[PDB]
Design a protein around this ligand. Structure first.
Ligand SMILES: NC(=O)N[C@@H](CC(=O)O)C(=O)O
Ligand SMILES: NC(=O)N[C@@H](CC(=O)O)C(=O)O
Ligand SMILES: [Zn+2]
Ligand SMILES: [Zn+2]
Ligand SMILES: [Zn+2]
Ligand SMILES: [Zn+2]
Ligand SMILES: [Zn+2]
Ligand SMILES: [Zn+2]
Lengths: 362, 362
């Protein structure tokens, strides 16, 4: 007896194309998405070249249109030089991503004044998302208030951060957030098994108390998003390991396991992987699109999932219950039981669909 | 320059068929919906016969399929006798409506124990909505906690009620709510103009402080819904006036006026008339469906709107800015500039669409 779900949306993935295609490309990353029950992805801009101007956006759009197997939108990234220059292409992007801490990125902003400039110049009706850890959450929330607009906080990982956001929501402030599976299902207790290379990720893995605080405050979490951040094992275990975990193929099985245990409901899951991604990012429906899952099947996560080029996973050895059996995307079978059946290029940029433009005042 | 909006959803309308068709029927009520930029409606069960058993549901479904011009779902109503009897038809309804106070309804529940019985027997994955005023909000919230499930509060009208819901949300409780336009745009100050017959409505009109509290707490309001409750003028001004206002044709023009004044944003409006109705009630997208509005057009609400058989309005004389120019429903022009162009019966029961069933565990 299979359960039919709507097409799930991951608003935070790194697909590494252009410029890092040994780690992942559009074709392999979207195969991993479909195998994880995800039919739409929002791809982050910290590629090489990074997506921080109109020519880079145009290049990435064509590469995505040619390689993606599921539908997508592409973020623009904020830089120290591009505030006020993105107005003509802003509406074609998923939103604007701000990198406000140290991580796998050179998109460094040196000054809060640069954050203010982006919040003042980016069109007020379009999404802004931030990599903002610990006190940086409070600081970017301040900039959002000074400029009278909303902000979405990426991968919330700490009790400190979820309680701050909770207090902001109680004051009626327009803030939303997402949480990634590794911050719900891994902790400091896993660092000995993972080791210091594989274990590198930003935000870093939390304490057991951090993990328990996220679960206790599920009502504060608007979205789940993988922060799929593939790097090869060689890279993860070498002299200067980059931060990040792959996670498209494991996120839904982990969360379905939690549903089966009563830790959250099926509805709680669908709000956070479908309805709230849709409404925060104004993403369009996908016609004739659905995901069929088997909630009874027990398996153990292996040393690598089939599709991501990362060819490793930090969830190796975890027992899960739940698996993706079939994905239909816009009327075509896209995935069955380990086989992807739509080619590179089947996927489309949802911001070009008439129903995918963000409504605005004339 | 027109603005294109998605198909808007009104989760609280009274279409009076079967049994009250001099006040409204499916054809006239859904014409009023389309003229108000609404493409999907959830119809309440306090008809004659009321929709409280499978035979009444089957009758209403056929009448709606034959008369509706826009798409719809039909609520079931809770009674003192039907707890535990609705399991086979529950998934075909919009949800279950509980009438917990005195209003235009005989669906009286005598005891909180009856509320508990409904919360225990209605399928836990399906919506429950309540007419619950003042302390009744707190009481039904208690029953929802005792039975470990969610509840949606209809037409919140008072500072007391919105602050209670605000405090519940801060504690992480699964409660959502809607507000009707007359509780945002009318108050006690209008009772002298309206008089005691026309002014009758449940919840009654609030004080200026009630209205200001709803606006101040917009972040707490999940949905706008009209509580379109048509009665004829003769009925409203006779010896025992029934409570209720018509409102499908005026709700969006009133709210667009507020947007133009900066009282809320276009996004705030779309969350509350599209995204959150979708996600609370698991309502499906409508393909090739959109509403085109003109935000510049200034007009004054007349003594009656063109389509509702109520043939009166409590908003007569209010100056508004914003009007519905065109509605396209599933690829057909449904409304242009005062003309409805889809016939009775064009509309469909969204719960019969594959994507309109509420997902559940096997
Ligand atoms: N999360 C990570 O550890 N790395 C991300 C960057 C990011 O999201 O910070 C990546 O792109 O590798
Ligand atoms: N709101 C009203 O005053 N009347 C409603 C019933 C209701 O929603 O209470 C009606 O159906 O007439
Ligand atoms: Zn393509
Ligand atoms: Zn990040
Ligand atoms: Zn990231
Ligand atoms: Zn029909
Ligand atoms: Zn009511
Ligand atoms: Zn009502």
């Amino acid at each position: 007896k299979l359960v039919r779900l709507p097409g799930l949306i991951d608003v935070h993935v790194h697909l590494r194309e252009p410029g890092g295609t040994h780690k992942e490309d559009f074709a392999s990353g979207t195969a991993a998405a479909l195998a994880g029950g995800i039919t739409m992805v929002c791809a982050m801009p910290n590629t090489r070249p990074p997506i921080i101007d109109a020519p880079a956006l145009a290049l990435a759009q064509k590469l995505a249109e040619a390689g993606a197997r599921c539908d997508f939108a592409l973020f623009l990234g904020a830089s120290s030089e591009n505030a006020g220059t993105l107005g003509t292409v802003a509406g074609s992007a998923a939103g604007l991503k701000l990198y406000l801490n140290e991580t796998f990125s050179e998109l460094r902003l040196d000054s809060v004044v640069q954050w203010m400039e982006h919040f003042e110049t980016w069109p007020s009706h379009l999404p802004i998302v931030a990599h903002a850890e610990q006190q940086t959450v409070a600081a970017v929330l301040m900039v959002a208030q000074l400029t009278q607009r909303s902000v979405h906080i990426c991968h919330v990982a700490r009790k400190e951060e979820i309680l701050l956001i909770k207090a902001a929501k109680a004051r009626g402030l327009p803030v939303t957030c997402e949480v990634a599976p590794h911050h719900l299902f891994l902790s400091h207790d896993d660092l000995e098994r993972l080791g210091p290379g594989k274990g590198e990720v930003r935000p870093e893995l939390g304490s057991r108390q951090d993990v328990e605080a996220l679960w206790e405050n599920m009502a504060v979490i608007d979205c789940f998003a993988s922060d799929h951040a593939p790097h090869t094992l060689e890279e993860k275990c070498g002299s200067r390991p980059p931060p990040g975990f792959p996670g498209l193929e494991t996120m839904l099985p982990l969360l379905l396991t939690a549903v089966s245990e009563g830790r959250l409901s099926l509805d709680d899951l669908l709000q956070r992987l479908h309805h709230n991604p849709r409404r925060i990012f104004h993403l369009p429906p996908q016609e004739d699109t659905y995901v069929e899952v088997d909630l009874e099947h027990e398996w153990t996560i292996p040393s690598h999932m089939p599709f991501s080029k990362a060819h490793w996973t930090p969830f190796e050895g975890q027992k899960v219950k739940g698996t993706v059996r079939c994905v239909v995307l816009r009327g075509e079978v896209a995935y069955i039981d380990g086989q992807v059946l739509v080619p590179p290029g089947y996927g489309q940029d949802v911001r070009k669909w008439p129903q995918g433009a963000v409504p605005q005042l004339p």
